[PDB]
Design a protein around this ligand. Structure first.
Ligand SMILES: Nc1ncnc2c1ncn2[C@@H]1O[C@H](COP(=O)(O)OP(=O)(O)O)[C@@H](O)[C@H]1O
Ligand SMILES: Nc1ncnc2c1ncn2[C@@H]1O[C@H](COP(=O)(O)OP(=O)(O)O)[C@@H](O)[C@H]1O
Ligand code: BEF
Ligand code: BEF
Ligand SMILES: [Mg+2]
Ligand SMILES: [Mg+2]
Lengths: 50, 140, 417, 417
């Protein structure tokens, strides 16, 4: 649900998920990393504070 | 349409000073630059206009590296199990098809890059045909 | 699922399989369309596919894996592979590949290979370390391919007579010179049956080029192994396509140390096809035939050889004469002495309606002491000397009677002593 | 009203029918225009129409139901059907359909089908469950089509001689090799009469391609069943249209387990037509003929086969030789050995003005032991051996005398014993 639950996840765990082909994956990688960040990173301060 | 492509490949002055293969290579570069200028994101594409049998069909090159910047042209060197790659490098996809190659800005950039490519090819050929006579006295 | 188990079954099996899959009325589509729909329905349940196809490349770069259902032509069942796999696993035309494949994904329309499993019935390790065909050294045949069955039925004559008329060896360059409507069809049927019974190890191959569908189905239900065919329902394009496919398949097999024996019929039709497809180079000779158009048949007849370390490629092609076409005449003329084995059939004996009809004095094998033993060769010499003075019909009746009182060739041998 | 009852009547009947309908002077319009006007007048009284037409599809998607009055061409009597009906009832070209139709409604100009009643003389249930033609398995003929009438009149000779010259079987691939002005017209008339008398169950079909209208009308009033024809009043377009129409009709019939026997004359004109319509692919051979232009005649001759479970498609096509056209020569050359039945007629015997004029030694059937019994085959062998040494004119006179003293073939058989 949260974005922080997705930034700590490499794209290797996406194409294996069903209904994630070309259009969906392309749209995700476009509208997620164009904001400066990227998909797949290692952090520990999550989720503060929920 | 592709009939216009055939007309412009058969209507060149220097027909063999720029062969049909290199004609269509320059046209593919034109269409790639046009599609690049279309989207705000940077993504390399190949055209493969199908010189004689059919029309063009844009593609999407990945340029496989371990980077992530503009992931439109990024994919890891190990993504090879799903989408049927079984690859290490050179993994490229064919996702987007049938772009527009006849609007105003596309035609403008195509004309510009075709002029550039034809002048470059003519200069290169006219210099290479004399390169074989290196170390000789020439008139002119 | 596996594709071959959809291959070997007839159309009614596909009908009931689609009915099991809860599919629309599918009696209207091609067999390959039914296979495509069934594979899509099976993979919709989250399943992978297993396929097998002979590989073919165009200048476009990518490759296509065809099946034997359409005699290696384009279809909804063939698999599309990227040039990357060809570059990596060192693939080339004729290399039959079996492995995991998937139905066409989003935007795709043909199957795609996932993981190679068997490259020409071999692991990719030694498949990548394959000796080149033209880089090999040809030899001659010592391994004698015995044509005698040993059962001695009514038709086995046409086989055993060759044991005294034209010896057969592995990698032999054989050509049949025969008029139409003489008995070549049953002749090649007999030869295929005999080689399959006596030598089941060597992969059988039969070439049906420019033929009628009845002969196609009769030969696809009588040969003791996988067969390929091609009727005249398509132009010479299909003919040249299947010729290249089969020649590269045989080349890859013999590179994998296989024993291939191709039976081609008829070669004049292949020449006509190659003439029709190849454009005129500006020079034509008598017969309306281009000069260098026969280069492809030439090559196809030259592919036969004997590998040194192991394996062989025997080619036995039939040619049509006495058809009245002077073109055909010239064709046979080009094929005067290109092969080291001649099987001459004459219409004069076949008009007397005795079978087979062998031209003993006109047929023979060059350098035949290297094929059989010494006593067999001496007895062949004795038989040739006995058959030379007499004619052809009397000689044929004599041979038929002598091989009718006896069953194995040793009896006729000792009876000739 | 029904359309077929307007079909079978001549022009004067339509004249008096229109006069009954209180119509303007209609002697000026085409028969189909008269039928259209009469159907409009009948439906103006609040009536529905009943029609029957063979179906044809273009790339436009929708279908047209043609009648045999114009030999399946466009006309004001043909019915227009939407692609929806073709998608629903699984329709295709050649599928003759009979059922309820209405005159063209407001803004329309051709008839439209309301409810299908008979799909190839069958309910839509089993019509939708139709086996595909090319998906079938060809076979050979055991059902012998007896050409002997048994009455033994003056002309029945030309039929009974075939009973000893060229046996006819269901699904046989037969071709006639004959010069012009030799007697092929009356020959096919005889064969049609004989097959209709001895086998009235099989639907008769005769192909009149590129012929004169007198022959058209003489054959449309002598064949014992429905016939199709095509004169040279239109270019090769009509010829190729009727060729496709008849081939798809025969295919749909044999898919409905029918026995179709098509008589084509002449096949060289069909080849000329297919050459004229098909554009040049950039390669031409000797004779001014394109390479892959003969693909359509090839296919048309390859459509003949024998169905396993039931039904057959026999094709008997005549070819023209000795015309002096080298083009025609090459055409016959392409048709050298594509068929398993040859009927050779020679101008040399026909110049001696005896009929028929059979080339016994040149004509024959391949694999004929599967057609007739054993004693008949042995007697055929005996007759062939007796006729081989002698020539052709003397042999023809001998056969004519022997079959003139006797009536049935058993008498000639026992007389040859
Ligand atoms: N070994 C044989 N025994 C019996 N009949 C034979 C034999 N070989 C040929 N025939 C005869 O030949 C005929 C078919 O010949 P075919 O296969 O058409 O020759 P081709 O293939 O050369 O045209 C058959 O009717 C058959 O009776
Ligand atoms: N079996 C026969 N009995 C009687 N007359 C015949 C017979 N065969 C041919 N003829 C005569 O020979 C002529 C044949 O000419 P035609 O049929 O136009 O040539 P083609 O045989 O090429 O069709 C006809 O006028 C016909 O009267
Ligand atoms: F079988 Be035949 F020789 F065409
Ligand atoms: F009818 Be004839 F053979 F011109
Ligand atoms: Mg044969
Ligand atoms: Mg005639």
């Amino acid at each position: 649900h949260y974005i922080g639950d997705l930034v700590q996840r490499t794209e290797v765990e996406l194409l294996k998920t069903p209904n994630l082909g070309k259009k969906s994956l392309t749209e995700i990688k476009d509208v997620l990393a164009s904001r400066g960040l990227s998909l797949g990173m290692r952090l520990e301060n999550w989720p503060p504070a929920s | 349409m592709n009939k216009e492509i055939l007309a412009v490949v058969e209507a060149v002055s220097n027909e063999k000073a720029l062969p049909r293969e290199k004609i269509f290579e320059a046209l593919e570069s034109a269409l790639a630059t046009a599609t690049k200028k279309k989207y705000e994101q940077e993504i390399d594409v190949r055209v493969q206009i199908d010189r004689k049998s059919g029309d063009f069909d844009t593609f999407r090159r990945w340029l496989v590296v371990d980077e992530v910047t503009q992931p439109t042209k990024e994919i890891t060197l190990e993504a090879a199990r799903y989408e049927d790659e079984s690859l290490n490098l050179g993994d490229y996809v064919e996702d987007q098809i049938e772009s527009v190659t006849f609007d105003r800005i596309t035609t403008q950039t195509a004309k510009q890059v075709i002029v550039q490519k034809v002048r470059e090819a003519e200069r290169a050929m006219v210099v290479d045909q004399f390169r074989e006579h290196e170390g000789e006295i020439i008139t002119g | 699922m596996n594709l071959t188990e959809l291959k070997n079954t007839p159309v009614s099996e596909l009908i009931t399989l689609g009915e099991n899959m809860g599919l629309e009325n599918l009696a209207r589509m091609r067999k390959q369309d039914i296979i495509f729909a069934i594979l899509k329905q099976h993979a919709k349940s989250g399943e992978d596919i297993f396929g097998d196809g002979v590989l073919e490349i165009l200048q476009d770069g990518f490759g296509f894996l065809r099946s034997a259902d359409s005699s290696y032509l384009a279809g909804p069942d063939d698999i599309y592979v990227s040039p990357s796999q060809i570059r990596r696993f060192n693939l080339r035309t004729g290399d039959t590949i079996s492995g995991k494949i998937r139905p066409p994904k989003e935007g795709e329309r043909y199957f795609a290979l996932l993981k190679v499993n068997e490259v020409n019935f071999d692991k990719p390790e030694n498949a990548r370390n394959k000796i080149l065909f033209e880089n090999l050294t040809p030899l001659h045949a010592n391994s004698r391919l015995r044509m005698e069955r040993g059962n001695g039925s009514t038709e086995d004559l046409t086989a055993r007579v060759l044991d005294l008329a034209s010896p057969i060896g592995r990698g032999q360059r054989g050509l049949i010179v025969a008029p139409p409507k003489a008995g070549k069809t049953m002749l090649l049927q007999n030869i295929a049956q005999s080689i399959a019974y006596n030598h089941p190890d060597c992969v059988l191959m039969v070439l049906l080029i420019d033929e009628r569908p009845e002969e196609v189905t009769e030969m696809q239900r009588l040969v003791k192994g996988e067969v390929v065919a091609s009727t005249f329902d398509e132009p010479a394009s299909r003919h040249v396509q299947v010729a290249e496919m089969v020649i590269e398949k045989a080349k890859r097999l013999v590179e994998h140390k296989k024993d291939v024996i191709i039976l081609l019929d008829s070669i004049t039709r292949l020449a006509r096809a190659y003439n029709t497809v190849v454009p005129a180079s500006g020079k034509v000779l008598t017969g309306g035939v281009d000069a260098n158009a026969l280069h492809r048949p030439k090559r196809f007849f030259g592919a036969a050889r004997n590998v040194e370390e192991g394996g062989s490629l025997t080619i036995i092609a039939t040619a049509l004469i006495d058809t009245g076409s002077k073109m055909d005449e010239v064709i046979y003329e080009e094929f005067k002495g290109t092969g080291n084995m001649e099987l001459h059939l004459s219409r004069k004996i076949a008009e007397k309606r005795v079978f087979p009809a062998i031209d003993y004095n006109r047929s023979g094998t060059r350098k035949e002491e290297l094929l059989t033993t010494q006593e067999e060769l001496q007895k062949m010499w004795i038989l040739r000397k006995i058959i030379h003075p007499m004619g052809e019909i009397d000689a044929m009746e004599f041979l038929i009677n002598k091989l009718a009182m006896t069953k194995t060739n040793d009896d006729f041998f000792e009876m000739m002593k």
